[PDB]
Nucleic acid binder design. Structure first.
Lengths: 131, 88, 122
RNA sequence: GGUGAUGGCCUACCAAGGCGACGACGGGUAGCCGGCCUGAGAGGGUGACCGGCCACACUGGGACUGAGAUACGGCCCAGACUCC
RNA sequence: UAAUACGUAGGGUCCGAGCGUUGUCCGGAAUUACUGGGCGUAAAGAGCUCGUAGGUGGUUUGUCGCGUUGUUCGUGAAAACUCACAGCUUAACUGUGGGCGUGCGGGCGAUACGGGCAGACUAGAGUACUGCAGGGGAGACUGGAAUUCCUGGUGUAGCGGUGGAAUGCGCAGAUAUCAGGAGGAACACCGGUGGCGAAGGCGGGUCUCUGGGCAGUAACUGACGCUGAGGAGCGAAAGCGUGGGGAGCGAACAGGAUUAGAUACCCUGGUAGUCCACGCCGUAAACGGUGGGUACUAGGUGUGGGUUUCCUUCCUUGGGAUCCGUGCCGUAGCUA
RNA sequence: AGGAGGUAAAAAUGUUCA
């Protein structure tokens, strides 16, 4: 069955970005919403709406493309998977794409990039690389 | 192959409230009746492997449900198995 | 595979085959030539390749090539055996090296004398 | 009871338990480590000098002495070997 | 026989009191891949299911702070390694100081994620109700065609068989034809890129018993789910056992033919077996050579089952929407 | 464009480096 909606979310994003879709609807989770907020702030998506479905709540990500359909995202990669959770200390955080990327880190200071995590001196669960 | 009357009979005394079917108690009761009927059917027709497989599936479903009940509250599990004549 | 498959069963490197087992960890061995003789190589090559069945100090009897032009070897000769593959000779992995207290150097070697036990003449 | 000390360590009795697929019990191999070699690293291999710990002192067993004993250059016994 | 690969000379090159060889280890080897591989055809998906342990876990509230993370303390001997300095004339080496000591234990914090605990929810899963399709399975009974055999007429000299023949069957009345009977097995047409089943596989009809699936309703429970080591079960055909049966077919076997030979292809026969009952076996190109579950990612076109809806003939397999299937084609992507 | 089925009987092998 479903085992990580984080990877589901990243995959919906990746496949829609490959197919040049403008929207991505999926189920809602507070964690996925926070991830979408990070992606919005780092500029990998245009916006994200949280709306109501027939049963629960949905996330509608308005993706972003340039004028010549340049994919605003070039890759997504779940890292802390179920079955193998990976945790990063503040020192050995990962540099995605030589730093031009963004690693999503879950910490007790919240959900924040590797840059923010190194700034705040903390680390935690490495959810994704979203160059 | 149970009829609606036999089902409702079972649900009366193994269901929690009037309209419950999905409860583990009710499901286990229904599956127990089906298992009895199918077991007698097989004691006659021993070479009905295609139905014995369905029997095994129902057995697994019943076991899963009883596992859920024992995980939730053990008194329900005990009352269920002693009221149905089950071993575990 | 999956991570749980790995933590259960793990990775096992393919077992490297022990080679030159007749030496038994030694670089060389001493042995008596039990039978000096000549062998015919594989099909593309043809020659009369000089070899010796030698009974080493490891309690192993192996075939060993005799490089160089000439050799003074008879049976009952004390010989020093090294490793080295001779392709055209299939069933052999060991060579004999000069300066073995019987195998004197090759005559008139003047380029690669160290590999054939030849002293410098001056 | 015994020990310096806890403890089936030992003993009488009592109960019938304890360990095992998370690999008991067996078989094989091996002294362990800091370290060393390699390798981008992870890792692999290794355990020489040097330094620490262990074990052993012809084999096996045993205690005595003593603060302390595997008591190499100590004791007792048995055994193999060597010698008078 | 015209060797830059052998041997020697020159000459060049790589090192240099060393140079080469052997042995051993690592590397290269992403060649056991955690970093860092794969399994349609390259080696690689168990024959398929069930299910134990285990692994894994939808949405959400609160809490614990176990994992996790931060900080601090102690320890992580010295030597080593590394950085810097200093000293043996330099270097090696040596020393000094720091770092390292990839960790562990205590203390003090954070609580996003995982997890535990206590709950909540319905989108997964399962149940109920209504319907639906279906060679799903088992048992019993039963039907007609056809073959073969038997009996009896008619009927006479060939039939059969092949590439061509011959064995063979017949002339004791065969083949053929008509009628009747016995028995066995398989079920034409329907019947197909069709349906069902986990797979194997399932096709005459009826009855009985029985399993699974799908759609719709959303009444119910409320993550109960997924996978599944081992294990258990099912598991074509052949085969084995016991007992029946035995028409046809038919390994073996026997003749005939072909052939250089033919232990074969072809022909004529023909035993086990194929069939039934109960059981063993437990394999197959058990193949989609593709494990299961879930989510997403262009479409087109057929077809099977079901729900609805719109032109409305208000005829209607007229079309559309949707769920489940099953096929062909074709993007992106993937692929040697 | 619409519409049954067929026949070729058997007939082997290939020292050298290439």
């Amino acid at each position: 069955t479903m085992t990580d909606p984080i990877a589901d979310f990243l995959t919906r994003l990746r496949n829609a970005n490959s197919a040049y879709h403008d929207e991505v609807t999926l189920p809602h989770s507070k964690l996925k919403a926070n991830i979408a907020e990070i992606l919005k702030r780092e500029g990998y998506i245009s916006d994200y709406r949280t709306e109501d479905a027939r049963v629960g709540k949905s996330l509608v990500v308005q993706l972003k493309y340039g004028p010549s359909r340049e994919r605003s995202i070039a890759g997504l990669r779940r890292v802390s998977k179920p079955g193998l959770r990976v945790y990063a200390k503040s020192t050995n955080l990962p540099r995605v794409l030589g730093g031009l990327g963004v690693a999503i880190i879950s910490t007790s200071s919240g959900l924040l990039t590797d840059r923010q995590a190194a700034r705040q001196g903390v680390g935690g669960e490495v959810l994704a690389y979203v160059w | 192959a149970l009829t609606a009357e036999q089902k409702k009979e079972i649900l009366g005394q193994y269901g929690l409230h009037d309209t419950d079917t999905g409860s583990p108690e009710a499901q286990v009761a229904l599956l127990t009746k089906r298992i009895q009927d199918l077991t007698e059917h097989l004691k006659v027709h021993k070479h009905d492997h295609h139905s014995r497989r369905g029997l095994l599936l129902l057995v697994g479903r019943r076991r899963r449900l009883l596992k859920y009940v024992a995980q939730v509250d053990v008194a329900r599990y005990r009352s269920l198995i002693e009221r149905l004549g089950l071993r575990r | 595979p999956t991570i749980q498959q790995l933590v259960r069963k793990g990775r096992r490197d393919k077992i490297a085959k022990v080679k030159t087992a007749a030496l038994k960890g030694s670089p060389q061995r001493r042995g008596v030539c039990t039978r000096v003789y000549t062998t015919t190589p594989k099909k593309p090559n043809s020659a009369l390749r000089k070899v010796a069945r030698v009974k080493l100090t490891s309690q192993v009897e192996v075939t060993a090539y005799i490089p160089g032009e000439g050799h003074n070897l008879q049976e009952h000769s004390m010989v020093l055996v090294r490793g080295g593959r001779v392709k055209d000779l299939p069933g052999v992995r060991y060579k004999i090296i000069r300066g073995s207290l019987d195998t004197q150097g090759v005559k008139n070697r003047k380029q690669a004398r160290s590999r054939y036990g030849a002293k410098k003449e001056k």
